[PDB]
Design a protein around this motif. Structure first.
Motif, mmCIF file in Angstrom:
data_model
loop_
_atom_site.group_PDB
_atom_site.id
_atom_site.type_symbol
_atom_site.label_atom_id
_atom_site.label_comp_id
_atom_site.label_asym_id
_atom_site.label_seq_id
_atom_site.Cartn_x
_atom_site.Cartn_y
_atom_site.Cartn_z
ATOM 1 N N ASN A 47 0.791 -1.229 0.000
ATOM 2 C CA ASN A 47 0.000 0.000 0.000
ATOM 3 C C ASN A 47 0.828 1.286 0.000
ATOM 4 O OD1 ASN A 47 -2.325 -1.582 -0.014
ATOM 5 N ND2 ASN A 47 -2.570 -1.517 2.228
ATOM 6 N N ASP A 48 1.971 1.279 0.686
ATOM 7 C CA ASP A 48 2.810 2.490 0.762
ATOM 8 C C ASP A 48 3.753 2.689 -0.448
ATOM 9 O OD1 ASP A 48 4.891 0.680 1.204
ATOM 10 O OD2 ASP A 48 5.395 1.465 3.195
ATOM 11 N N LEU A 83 15.882 -2.920 -10.162
ATOM 12 C CA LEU A 83 16.762 -3.143 -9.012
ATOM 13 C C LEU A 83 16.603 -4.572 -8.464
ATOM 14 C CD1 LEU A 83 16.280 0.330 -7.259
ATOM 15 C CD2 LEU A 83 18.293 -0.486 -8.566
ATOM 16 N N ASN A 84 16.181 -5.496 -9.333
ATOM 17 C CA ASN A 84 15.951 -6.912 -8.967
ATOM 18 C C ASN A 84 14.901 -7.100 -7.874
ATOM 19 O OD1 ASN A 84 19.472 -7.540 -9.594
ATOM 20 N ND2 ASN A 84 17.725 -7.859 -10.955
ATOM 21 N N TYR A 85 13.982 -6.134 -7.782
ATOM 22 C CA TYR A 85 12.914 -6.112 -6.770
ATOM 23 C C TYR A 85 13.449 -6.344 -5.349
ATOM 24 C CZ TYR A 85 7.803 -5.603 -6.446
ATOM 25 O OH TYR A 85 6.534 -5.113 -6.161
ATOM 26 N N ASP A 86 14.597 -5.731 -5.072
ATOM 27 C CA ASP A 86 15.215 -5.769 -3.768
ATOM 28 C C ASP A 86 14.475 -4.709 -2.963
ATOM 29 O OD1 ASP A 86 16.811 -5.250 -1.490
ATOM 30 O OD2 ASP A 86 18.669 -5.648 -2.564
ATOM 31 N N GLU A 87 13.513 -5.164 -2.157
ATOM 32 C CA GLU A 87 12.632 -4.278 -1.414
ATOM 33 C C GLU A 87 13.383 -3.384 -0.440
ATOM 34 O OE1 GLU A 87 9.160 -6.396 0.086
ATOM 35 O OE2 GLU A 87 9.131 -7.661 -1.713
ATOM 36 N N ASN A 88 14.415 -3.904 0.228
ATOM 37 C CA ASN A 88 15.223 -3.078 1.129
ATOM 38 C C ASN A 88 15.960 -1.950 0.383
ATOM 39 O OD1 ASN A 88 14.568 -4.473 3.580
ATOM 40 N ND2 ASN A 88 16.096 -6.042 3.084
ATOM 41 N N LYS A 89 16.481 -2.273 -0.791
ATOM 42 C CA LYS A 89 17.226 -1.279 -1.577
ATOM 43 C C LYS A 89 16.292 -0.203 -2.113
ATOM 44 C CE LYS A 89 20.560 -2.955 -3.893
ATOM 45 N NZ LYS A 89 21.375 -3.539 -4.985
ATOM 46 N N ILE A 90 15.135 -0.622 -2.612
ATOM 47 C CA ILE A 90 14.122 0.305 -3.117
ATOM 48 C C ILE A 90 13.685 1.274 -2.016
ATOM 49 C CG2 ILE A 90 11.752 0.526 -4.003
ATOM 50 C CD1 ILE A 90 12.344 -2.339 -5.336
ATOM 51 N N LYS A 91 13.384 0.735 -0.835
ATOM 52 C CA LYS A 91 12.908 1.556 0.276
ATOM 53 C C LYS A 91 13.976 2.532 0.711
ATOM 54 C CE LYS A 91 11.509 -2.185 2.611
ATOM 55 N NZ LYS A 91 11.062 -2.887 3.857
ATOM 56 N N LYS A 92 15.219 2.057 0.773
ATOM 57 C CA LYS A 92 16.332 2.910 1.185
ATOM 58 C C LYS A 92 16.544 4.072 0.184
ATOM 59 C CE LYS A 92 20.057 3.977 3.670
ATOM 60 N NZ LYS A 92 20.887 2.950 4.333
ATOM 61 N N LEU A 93 16.573 3.760 -1.108
ATOM 62 C CA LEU A 93 16.717 4.816 -2.118
ATOM 63 C C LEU A 93 15.564 5.812 -2.021
ATOM 64 C CD1 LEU A 93 18.172 6.005 -4.598
ATOM 65 C CD2 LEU A 93 16.719 4.537 -6.037
#
Length: 204
Positions: A33-34, A68-78
């Motif tokens: 959702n976010d 970004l290979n759907y790396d959720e941690n990397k996406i959120k951090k960026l």
């Protein structure tokens, strides 16, 4: 001709199959959702067309995530790093937009190449094309893969600058905008991927 063509295609065939599977998986994922922080509460609407495209279009967001290979941690951090940026002239909004655009356009060009290079089209290349042309297509696909990985490394490095507090950017979003600009803006260029894709598409 046929023998050499088969060897060249075999350099990329297994990878194309794997990418096609992983792209499918990504398309099926349910977005939180976010939107991993890529939402209108952290990014102001009507400041930049590419930010707006991301806010409006779940398909573009999905392309960005897959870039970004759907790396959720990397996406959120960026996303949380980009949301901190500021500037006196709103240039930072253009830079954020450039970052999003670069990711989704490289992924889109990459996915177009995977989608074009079906097993049937690979067979067509082996049987019907000069080896010079097959080698060019094969090497071009690998260049497209490298463009994708260089993009991922730009993102890793931007995150790196934030983690290192380069120039004091952790405490100052204006400095952060400048660090990202000076460090990386010159390197952000999805047009190269588009050119490589065109070079794959044309002979086909």
């Amino acid at each position: 001709a046929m023998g050499e063509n088969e060897k060249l295609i075999n350099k990329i065939g297994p990878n194309i199959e794997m990418f096609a599977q992983t792209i499918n998986t990504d398309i099926q994922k349910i977005e939180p959702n976010d939107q991993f922080g890529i939402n209108k509460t952290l990014f102001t609407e009507k400041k930049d067309n590419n930010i707006d495209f991301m806010l409006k279009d779940n398909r573009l967001r999905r392309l960005f995530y897959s870039s970004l290979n759907y790396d959720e941690n990397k996406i959120k951090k960026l996303a949380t790093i980009l949301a901190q940026t500021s500037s006196s002239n709103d240039y930072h909004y253009t830079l954020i937009g450039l970052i999003f655009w670069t990711g989704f356009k490289i992924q889109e060009a990459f996915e177009s190449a995977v989608n074009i290079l079906t097993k049937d089209e690979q067979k067509r290349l082996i049987f019907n094309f000069r080896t010079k042309t097959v080698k060019e297509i094969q090497e071009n696909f690998e260049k497209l893969m490298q463009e994708r990985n260089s993009w991922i490394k730009i993102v890793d490095n931007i995150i790196g600058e934030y983690d290192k507090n380069t120039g004091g950017c952790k405490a100052d979003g204006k400095i952060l905008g400048e660090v990202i600009r000076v460090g990386y803006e010159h390197e952000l260029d999805s047009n190269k991927s588009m050119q490589i894709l065109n070079n794959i598409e044309t002979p086909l």
